[PDB]
Amino acid sequence: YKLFITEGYEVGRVNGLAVIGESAGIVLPIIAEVTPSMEGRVIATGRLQEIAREAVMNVSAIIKKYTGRDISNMDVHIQFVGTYEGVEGDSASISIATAVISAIEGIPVDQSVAMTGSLSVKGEVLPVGGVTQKIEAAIQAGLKKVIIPKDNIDDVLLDAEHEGKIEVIPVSRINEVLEHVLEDGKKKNRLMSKFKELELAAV
Amino acid sequence: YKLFITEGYEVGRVNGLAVIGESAGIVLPIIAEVTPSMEGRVIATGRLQEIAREAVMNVSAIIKKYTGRDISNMDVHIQFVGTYEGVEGDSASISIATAVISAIEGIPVDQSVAMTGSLSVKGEVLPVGGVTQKIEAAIQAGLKKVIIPKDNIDDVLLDAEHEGKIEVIPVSRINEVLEHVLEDGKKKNRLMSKFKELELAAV
Amino acid sequence: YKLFITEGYEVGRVNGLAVIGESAGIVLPIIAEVTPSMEGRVIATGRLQEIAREAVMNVSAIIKKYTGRDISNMDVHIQFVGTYEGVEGDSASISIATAVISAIEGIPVDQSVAMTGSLSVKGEVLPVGGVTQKIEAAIQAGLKKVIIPKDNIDDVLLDAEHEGKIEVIPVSRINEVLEHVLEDGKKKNRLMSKFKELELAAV
Amino acid sequence: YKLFITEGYEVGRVNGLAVIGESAGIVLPIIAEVTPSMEGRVIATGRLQEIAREAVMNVSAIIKKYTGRDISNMDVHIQFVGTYEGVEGDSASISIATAVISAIEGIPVDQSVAMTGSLSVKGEVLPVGGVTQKIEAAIQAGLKKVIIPKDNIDDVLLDAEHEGKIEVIPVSRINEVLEHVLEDGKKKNRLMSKFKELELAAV
Amino acid sequence: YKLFITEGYEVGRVNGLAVIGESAGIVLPIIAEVTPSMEGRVIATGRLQEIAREAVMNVSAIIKKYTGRDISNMDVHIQFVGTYEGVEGDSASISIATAVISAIEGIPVDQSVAMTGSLSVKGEVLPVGGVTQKIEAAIQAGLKKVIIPKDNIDDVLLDAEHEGKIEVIPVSRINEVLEHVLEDGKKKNRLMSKFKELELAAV
Amino acid sequence: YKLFITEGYEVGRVNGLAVIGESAGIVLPIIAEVTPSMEGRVIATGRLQEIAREAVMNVSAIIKKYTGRDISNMDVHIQFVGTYEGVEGDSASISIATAVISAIEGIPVDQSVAMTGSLSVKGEVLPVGGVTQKIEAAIQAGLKKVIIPKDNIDDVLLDAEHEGKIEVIPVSRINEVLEHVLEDGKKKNRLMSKFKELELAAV
Ligand SMILES: [Ca+2]
Ligand SMILES: [Ca+2]
Ligand SMILES: [Ca+2]
Ligand SMILES: [Ca+2]
Ligand SMILES: [Ca+2]
Ligand SMILES: [Ca+2]
Ligand SMILES: [Ca+2]
Ligand SMILES: [Ca+2]
Ligand SMILES: [Ca+2]
Ligand SMILES: [Ca+2]
Ligand SMILES: [Ca+2]
Ligand SMILES: [Ca+2]
């Protein structure tokens, strides 16, 4: 049995990447759900709950500004799949942000694409540590692609036999992440049209 | 005397399964109660309190979304029956989730059915470790059926004389767990009607 | 001098029973006090503080649900009388639960009645170990009655000359414990009227 | 030089009594200070730190209930004067409780009065071991009076020439201890007025 | 990879300075975003969230008074780039205030200029601790200029080889900070015209 | 660098006095700003925000009654200069009230005068604790005068070498505070003319 899925499309689930110990990479799947608040809360537990809060607050800024979803009146539940002492997650993890966008919009995410990076409140993907070891974990898991922050491209140093095994996609901003992982369709086209103004503002 | 009941129907009580040490299985009964908050709290103590928090937060997402119960204004008390050093429970244990649903709805649970698995915030039952040893513990306890995550079916390897002694029921999602363990009746039919939208969204 | 009282009625004090070593029984008196929180805390120290927490959290569920006392805004102080290495107390000890109910309601407890058992969050008295040795300790202390969980009746095996010396009262639920130990009067009648719904829900 | 004072009145200092080895008595002075917490802590070190915690938690119940001092927002520092291997202190020692009340109220304690006993969470003074040997230690120290738990009066057996040398004062409850040791004055009268409800509730 | 940018102009991003431990300086970039409130909230998490609240409330006074932006009907998201135990930020940090003004006005900030100081509700820049160590951190980061409170000029003591490497700009008030860091243009000229009345009122 | 100014006149800034720990005095400068509400809010953060609310609500009564300023349609921002765990401020601090009056009227306050006291809703200055230690802090800061509540005159006990170093001014009411600290001029004369009716009503 595995705790991640490696192919196919699922709503609210993203294959993020993290580190354990100082250096070893892991696949850290995130599952998100949004509910009416019946003020809304970020509902998370465990050692990574602060990263969940960072990611959800940061993605909420972009969701309010560019899509107009009233995420402040939602409860946002973040689940980390897999429990390990010593996990270090990405600040404001883009995997968590992506899972929330998927959950709110009902648009599934490609499970064959892993990702790492930190989401800024403006929508930029900021660089992170451990990118080589995270890519190695994605290869060992049988994933097809890995999204990384563009400023981490020169941090990648793979041995001879991790080379050629995974596609590495550098990104600047969240809308590029979404382009690469959301299932193609009308819903996706509508959502990306809203995030166009984020891209225009940034470039 | 035993600490579990093996037949009959009881509100708020579920025969979960866990491991002690690395490998040995145990029956881990859960008892849940919900109260008005007089914000509500998850009230749990001991070594497994984090699993209780995970389960209750995850089941709360599905309860709010699909049934509309205001579980955020309830106190949720989780009790683990039996105290053992070295118990490892299922992340977000489905036994705890089930006990909470039973307690809130007032619908009793079949004590002859044990279960193991992890509840996702979306209602899926995720795979767990130790399923063979947990099934062995259920057989030694005299239980009739065991619910397991479907992805763990190929993890089961029972000796000649544990074979034929217990029914093993693989599940994908929480609504299937409820179908197998809640007492038949009008209350159950009403509740399952609400969870229909979860099943439709998932398939 | 003794550390327990064996006759008479006192608020907040209950003669519980425990084991020391593997097998030897002891009388373990509990004294409880409740105070305004000036969120409230469970205040306990020593080797048995976890049992105190279990008992107080479990009894709080039933107090909130059936009596409406705002115990979440109280500090609950639990004292164990007598200090011994190697004491094993009853999980969620009913003696502690009873002491708390007595303390909150101001209704004294019969000191001639000892008790053992574990309180469920639903109000049931769950079975415990060592009941014969605990009854022996109650007899040696000169107590008149001992409340035990009903599922432990067939665990009792007393020698010829412990026989006939103490009344053994099996119980299913907390309201029966209270019926046997609280001082008769208007206060008691009012309290038991509230716990009637617990009995009805259980049977 | 001595480590105890035997006459006069001092804030926060009480001449308690303890045992060393199995049987020998000692005077064990306690010094307490309370500070704002800048949640408050019980700050104690050494072999007797658990007795300090018991005493301070138990006296805190009575302080909150009857005097309304917010002792939960104070740090409570307990010092044992004199360092000896093998000291056995009184559970929930009344000397520690008294020192804390004195420190919080700013009312000095009579250094000519020693005391032994255990404080209940309800304000009762519970019996202790070794009272004869503790009285002997108080006589050898030149103290004038010794407060003991009333249930220990029949434990006193003094030789011919310890007789007639010290006044022995049996007590039921903490308010009687305070009456005997706090310096007379307006502050004391105000404090004792608050503890009147404890005495009324007890009798 | 770095977490700060050292040249160029970006909306909503400012290179602030902080201390870690007692003495060591760090560059602490701030990213701000403002959104419609869909009352508005200050949205911040982590150890520095109180400094974020102080800065945003203080800058809001000056924004309302002098520019008339309805910041009370905005959500203000503050992100600290870089996560470190033991960071001590500037009270009411001017870097946070500047980031908010930039975000609301859409006027980018010079990334080659670091800053430290505390914003008063009247628009003054108040002195801070650790200015030498903060300047050292800015030099080690390759920044070109550092804005400091004027009252901290005599606190600067740089070794021989930190000297000559960075321009140090003392300021009295926020409008001077903006003059030094906002990108020149029509937007900036319009904004500074509004803050003219702040300067006139102050001098 | 210091966080207080000790000479000169500034709008909206007052050198208040507070205590840290139990006893030590500190200078606690307050800075206030008022803005149109664009209902108005009291905007304050940190550990002292309740004192800010008390002071601003109490001073608002006197401002509405005697000066007719529509302070209910203003936002009132209160800043405490200096951040310390364990600060205890004056209830309804007169320093905060004074800062607000100065800010609304545009009349600067003498920075050489410190003050302590609590403002009543009727304009009286009520007594406070720690006045000796607060005066000591003002002397150590190099302030020239300290305003105290008249009922605290007999609480002052300064050592030989704090004596003769600061002028101590006892007051009954807010209009006397203003007479001593507001800059002389036409604005002040106009304001004091309005508060004349407060003095007449009080005497
Ligand atoms: Ca390729
Ligand atoms: Ca590539
Ligand atoms: Ca079968
Ligand atoms: Ca099957
Ligand atoms: Ca009988
Ligand atoms: Ca019987
Ligand atoms: Ca005598
Ligand atoms: Ca006597
Ligand atoms: Ca230069
Ligand atoms: Ca310069
Ligand atoms: Ca003079
Ligand atoms: Ca004078």
H, E, C per residue of C74-143: EEEEEEECCCCCCEECCCCEHHHHHHHHHHHHCCCEECCEEECCEECCCCEEECCCCHHHHHHHHHHCCC
Secondary structure class of C160 (helix, strand, coil): coil
Cβ-defined contact of E64 to F32 (cutoff 8 Å): no
Secondary structure class of B71 (helix, strand, coil): helix
Tokens representing B92?
């977000």
- E strands, E81-124, are 87-88, 109-110, 113-115, 118-119
- The DSSP bridge partners found for residue A118 are A93, A126
**For residues A74 and B26, what is the distance between their CA atoms, to the nearest angstrom?**
39
Secondary structure class of D144 (helix, strand, coil): coil
Q: Contact, B191 vs B105, CB < 8 A?
A: yes
- The DSSP bridge partners found for residue D75 are D35
> Interface partners of E (3+ CB pairs, < 8 Å)?
A, F
Tokens representing C18?
């425990």
**For residues D67 and D61, what is the distance between their CA atoms, to the nearest angstrom?**
10
Residues whose CB falls within 8 Å of the CB of residue D46, separated by 6 or more in sequence, listed in order: D80, D83
Which helix (H) or strand (E) is B118 found in, with range? strand B118-119
User: Taking the alpha carbons of E98, E100, E101, E106 in that order, is the dihedral positive or negative?
Assistant: positive
Q: Contact, A72 vs A40, CB < 8 A?
A: yes
Chain A residue numbers touching E84 (CB-CB < 8 A)? none
Residue of B6, B40, B1 lying closest to B141 (CA atoms): B6
User: How does strand B42-43 pair with strand E74-80?
Assistant: unpaired
How many secondary structure helices (H) and strands (E) does chain D include?
A: 5, 12
Cβ-defined contact of B38 to C64 (cutoff 8 Å): yes
Residue of A86, A21, A29, A77 lying closest to A49 (CA atoms): A77
**For residues C39 and C74, what is the distance between their CA atoms, to the nearest angstrom?**
7
Residue of C22, C18, C4 lying closest to C48 (CA atoms): C18
Chain F residue numbers touching E58 (CB-CB < 8 A)? 77, 79
**For residues B14 and E162, what is the distance between their CA atoms, to the nearest angstrom?**
68
Q: How many angstroms separate the CA of residue A81 from the nearest CA in chain B?
A: 9
- The DSSP bridge partners found for residue C18 are C26
Which helix (H) or strand (E) is C197 found in, with range? helix C186-202
User: Taking the alpha carbons of C90, C96, C101, C102 in that order, is the dihedral positive or negative?
Assistant: positive
Helix axes A94-105, A174-181, angle to 10 degrees: 60
Secondary structure class of E74 (helix, strand, coil): strand
Q: Contact, B117 vs B127, CB < 8 A?
A: yes
Q: Contact, B147 vs B178, CB < 8 A?
A: no
**For residues F156 and F202, what is the distance between their CA atoms, to the nearest angstrom?**
26
**For residues B118 and B55, what is the distance between their CA atoms, to the nearest angstrom?**
8
Q: For residue A90, how many other CB atoms are within 10 A of its CB?
A: 30
Q: What is the largest CA-CA distance in chain D?
A: 54
Tell me which residues of chain D, numbers 31 to 70, contact chain F at a CB-CB cutoff of 8 Å: 35-36, 38
**For residues A44 and A76, what is the distance between their CA atoms, to the nearest angstrom?**
8
Secondary structure class of B4 (helix, strand, coil): coil
Q: How many angstroms separate the CA of residue F3 from the nearest CA in chain E?
A: 7
> Which ligand has the nearest atom to the CA of E163?
9
The owner of tokens 């029972």 is B158
Q: Contact, D100 vs D93, CB < 8 A?
A: no
Tokens representing A23?
């250096």
Q: Tell me the helix, strand and coil percentages in chain E, rounded to 5.
A: 35, 30, 35
Which of C50, C57, C155 has its CB closest to that of B77? C57
Residue of D146, D142, D124, D125 lying closest to D134 (CA atoms): D146
Q: Contact, B162 vs B26, CB < 8 A?
A: no
* Angle (nearest 5°) at CA D163 between D162 and D164: 120
**For residues A169 and A150, what is the distance between their CA atoms, to the nearest angstrom?**
8
Which of B65, B91, B150, B188 is catalytic? The answer is B91
Q: Contact, E34 vs E86, CB < 8 A?
A: no
How many secondary structure helices (H) and strands (E) does chain C include?
A: 5, 12
Task: Name the fold adopted by F1-203.
Answer: Ribosomal Protein S5; domain 2 (3.30.230)
**For residues D150 and D168, what is the distance between their CA atoms, to the nearest angstrom?**
10
- D7 by Cβ neighbours in 10 Å (0-12 / 13-18 / 19+) ranks as exposed
Q: What is the dihedral of CA C48, C53, C56, C57, to 10 degrees?
A: -150
**For residues E58 and E66, what is the distance between their CA atoms, to the nearest angstrom?**
13
D38, D70, D73, D75: best mutation site toward chain F, by most F Cβ within 10 Å?
Answer: D38
Which helix (H) or strand (E) is C27 found in, with range? strand C24-36
User: For chain F, first and last CA: distance in Å?
Assistant: 44
**For residues C34 and D64, what is the distance between their CA atoms, to the nearest angstrom?**
10
User: How does strand F113-115 pair with strand F145-149?
Assistant: parallel
Tokens representing F135?
């005066």
CA–centroid distance, D145 to ligand 7, in Å, is 9
Residue A98 carries which DSSP code? H
HEC string for B132-190: HHHHHHHHHCCCCEEEEEHHHHHHCCCCCCCCCCCEEEEECEHHHHHHHHECCCHHHHH
Q: After which residues is chain C discontinuous, taking C to N > 2.5 Å?
A: 38
Determine the residue type at A65.
Answer: K
Helix axes C49-62, C94-105, angle to 10 degrees: 60
Chain C residue numbers touching B41 (CB-CB < 8 A)? 72
**For residues A171 and D95, what is the distance between their CA atoms, to the nearest angstrom?**
69
Residues whose CB falls within 8 Å of the CB of residue E161, separated by 6 or more in sequence, listed in order: none
Q: For residue D83, how many other CB atoms are within 10 A of its CB?
A: 10
Determine the residue type at F159.
Answer: D
* Angle (nearest 5°) at CA F181 between F177 and F184: 120
Which of B62, B91, B155 has its CB closest to that of A1? B155
Determine the residue type at E160.
Answer: A
**For residues E125 and C43, what is the distance between their CA atoms, to the nearest angstrom?**
47
Contacts for D160-169: CB closer than 8 Å, 24+ residues apart: D162/D135, D162/D136, D165/D139, D166/D135, D166/D138, D166/D139, D168/D135, D169/D113, D169/D145
Q: Contact, D36 vs D152, CB < 8 A?
A: no
**For residues F49 and F56, what is the distance between their CA atoms, to the nearest angstrom?**
11
Chain A residue numbers touching E85 (CB-CB < 8 A)? none
Cβ-defined contact of C75 to D61 (cutoff 8 Å): yes
The owner of tokens 């959290």 is C57
Q: For residue D17, how many other CB atoms are within 10 A of its CB?
A: 32
- E192 by Cβ neighbours in 10 Å (0-12 / 13-18 / 19+) ranks as middle
Tokens representing E8?
């160029």
The owner of tokens 């208040």 is F16
Cα D166 to chain centroid distance, Å, stands at 17
Secondary structure class of F23 (helix, strand, coil): coil
Determine the residue type at E116.
Answer: T
Q: Contact, D135 vs D162, CB < 8 A?
A: yes
Q: How many angstroms separate the CA of residue A160 from the nearest CA in chain B?
A: 34
Q: Does C11 touch chain D (CB under 8 A)?
A: yes
Cα F83 to chain centroid distance, Å, stands at 18
Please give the resolution of this entry in Å, rounded to 1 decimal. Answer: 1.2
* Angle (nearest 5°) at CA A117 between E135 and A91: 60
Residue of A155, A111, A160, A164 lying closest to A133 (CA atoms): A155
Q: What is the dihedral of CA B108, B109, B110, B115, to 10 degrees?
A: 180
Residue of E80, C42, D11, D115 lying closest to B44 (CA atoms): C42
CA–centroid distance, A203 to ligand 2, in Å, is 21
Q: At residue F52, what are phi and psi to the nearest 5 degrees?
A: -60, -45
**For residues E69 and E9, what is the distance between their CA atoms, to the nearest angstrom?**
23
**For residues E95 and D52, what is the distance between their CA atoms, to the nearest angstrom?**
48
Tokens representing A2?
């595995």
The CB-side HSE value for C178 (13 A sphere, CA atoms) comes to 31
Tokens representing F75?
């936002």
**For residues D168 and D148, what is the distance between their CA atoms, to the nearest angstrom?**
7
Which helix (H) or strand (E) is E175 found in, with range? helix E174-181
Residues whose CB falls within 8 Å of the CB of residue B35, separated by 6 or more in sequence, listed in order: B74, B75, B77, C61, C64, C65
The owner of tokens 């009308």 is A186
Q: Contact, E16 vs E114, CB < 8 A?
A: yes
Q: For residue C170, how many other CB atoms are within 10 A of its CB?
A: 15
